[PDB]
Amino acid sequence: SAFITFEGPEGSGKTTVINEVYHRLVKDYDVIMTREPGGVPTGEEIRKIVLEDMDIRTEAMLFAASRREHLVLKVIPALKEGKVVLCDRYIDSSLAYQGYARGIGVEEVRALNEFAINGLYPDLTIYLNVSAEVGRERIIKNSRLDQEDLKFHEKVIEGYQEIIRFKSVNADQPLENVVEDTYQTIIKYLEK
Amino acid sequence: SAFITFEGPEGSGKTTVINEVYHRLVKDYDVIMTREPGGVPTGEEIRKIVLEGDMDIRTEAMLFAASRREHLVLKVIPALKEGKVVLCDRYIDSSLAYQGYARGIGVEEVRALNEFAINGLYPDLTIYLNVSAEVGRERIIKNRLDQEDLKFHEKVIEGYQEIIRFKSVNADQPLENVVEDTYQTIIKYLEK
């Protein structure tokens, strides 16, 4: 089994990467791709409460609760089946977004997440490392960004910077290269 | 203002005491009493998810942590800023004794969870209704018990013991006496 998470700011081509890597790994591996809450009912119920000016800490705890449901009801049973699990975003996202970019403190958010994952850290974490400039362009094309969004975007990147199982891939290259690098990085882990 | 919480295991007379002490204090102080989640919408939603649950206890602990903060930010804090005395039935200490000790999640982990949730907002005074396991058992029965229940009850009391802003009150006495002591205990604090 292998628990593989994918991390990165918006504009890192994370969606394309996970989907294309998934499609290539599926040939030889019992692999599944998921993203919290990933269909888990309670997880969905929890998320929805947020979706419906809620305190940022309240939000953080709900996302944490949702994360654990997805972990206990979907990821673990999968890892026990001996499957490779590709997860779009995990504890690191919360650290960079809630802890760093939003101001709660990487400190407290990490303790929260450790409470949620109960020692189950990713076997491998791909960090799609994209510069703010290239990231910004991908974000726009996938729609000029507000001065505030640009700033927050930059803070998320710095957050991940500080944070970095980690295997960084250059997400400033064309997505075809970002896909090849991520795939090789992964096949390398699954073969050793 | 003053944030006063009431703690104690089942069968300690807690409900009767807070209510009787509340009615009595309203006559001479600008006080209100609330019971988590105190009617806060978000609190009721977050809670119901737990009620509609074999749910993982950490998930439960986090959801109840979320509920506690909504109640804190949307109700307790605003009332405290209005110069009011706020009597609260249950707070972090309850979680510590129940989830932390009794349920065996880990006092330290549950503590960290609650600190994230209260963000430094600790009670000014905490009333611990100290009742013996034997008297508590009898009150519960008064209002035969299974062996697991009895032992869980015991763990709860043992947890509170280790946790103990605290002013303990001998809850083995007749309720009438528990209320008086509790009332005199609070009055003392409010007039110092």
Ligand SMILES: [Cl-]
């Ligand atoms: Cl999914």
Ligand SMILES: [Cl-]
């Ligand atoms: Cl399982």
Ligand SMILES: [Cl-]
């Ligand atoms: Cl890189």
Ligand SMILES: [Cl-]
């Ligand atoms: Cl491209």
Ligand SMILES: [Cl-]
């Ligand atoms: Cl009595």
